[PDB]
Design a protein around this ligand. Sequence first.
Ligand SMILES: Cn1nc([C@@H]2O[C@H](CO)[C@H](O)[C@H](n3cc(-c4ccc(Br)c(F)c4F)nn3)[C@H]2O)n(-c2cc(Cl)ccc2C(F)(F)F)c1=S
Ligand SMILES: [Cl-]
Length: 138
Amino acid sequence: PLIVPYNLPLPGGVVPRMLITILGTVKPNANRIALDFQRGNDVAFHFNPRFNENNRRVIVCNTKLDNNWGREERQSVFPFESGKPFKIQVLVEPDHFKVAVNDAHLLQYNHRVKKLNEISKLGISGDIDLTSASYTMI
Ligand SMILES: Cn1nc([C@@H]2O[C@H](CO)[C@H](O)[C@H](n3cc(-c4ccc(Br)c(F)c4F)nn3)[C@H]2O)n(-c2cc(Cl)ccc2C(F)(F)F)c1=S
Ligand SMILES: [Cl-]
């Protein structure tokens, strides 16, 4: 087991063809999960499953610049379930992050922060037991 919140360093930043894989289990009665790809204090890509936002399950994605959140991108496809094991894969492509959950494409998030090699850490937080967090080049 890994302790949450967990920081995964991304040495030399992200780059196209880098694949990040996160394995864990959603806690029973979970409320939220978050992945935060950080450029210093900025959050280049925040991926935030919300299990009960006005009795709806939604994934909210955004960017934080100078401590301000931007325009939300929302996805109603919601592949996570309380109590159950998941796999998140984030593939860096030239123009977006591509996210798959449990081997099924979920969403893409266009790069707003364009200095990819300065996005040097991934934070993993929220209502999970974390099994593994790693990266490889494809
Ligand atoms: C309903 N709601 N949600 C938000 C913010 O909406 C953002 C996305 O647009 C982020 O999700 C942010 N957030 C979430 C977490 C967070 C932490 C700990 C774990 Br553990 C974990 F899983 C996590 F998601 N930290 N910051 C969240 O607080 N805000 C919000 C709140 C403030 Cl004070 C200012 C601006 C906003 C808004 F502009 F974005 F809307 C509202 S109101
Ligand atoms: Cl939240």
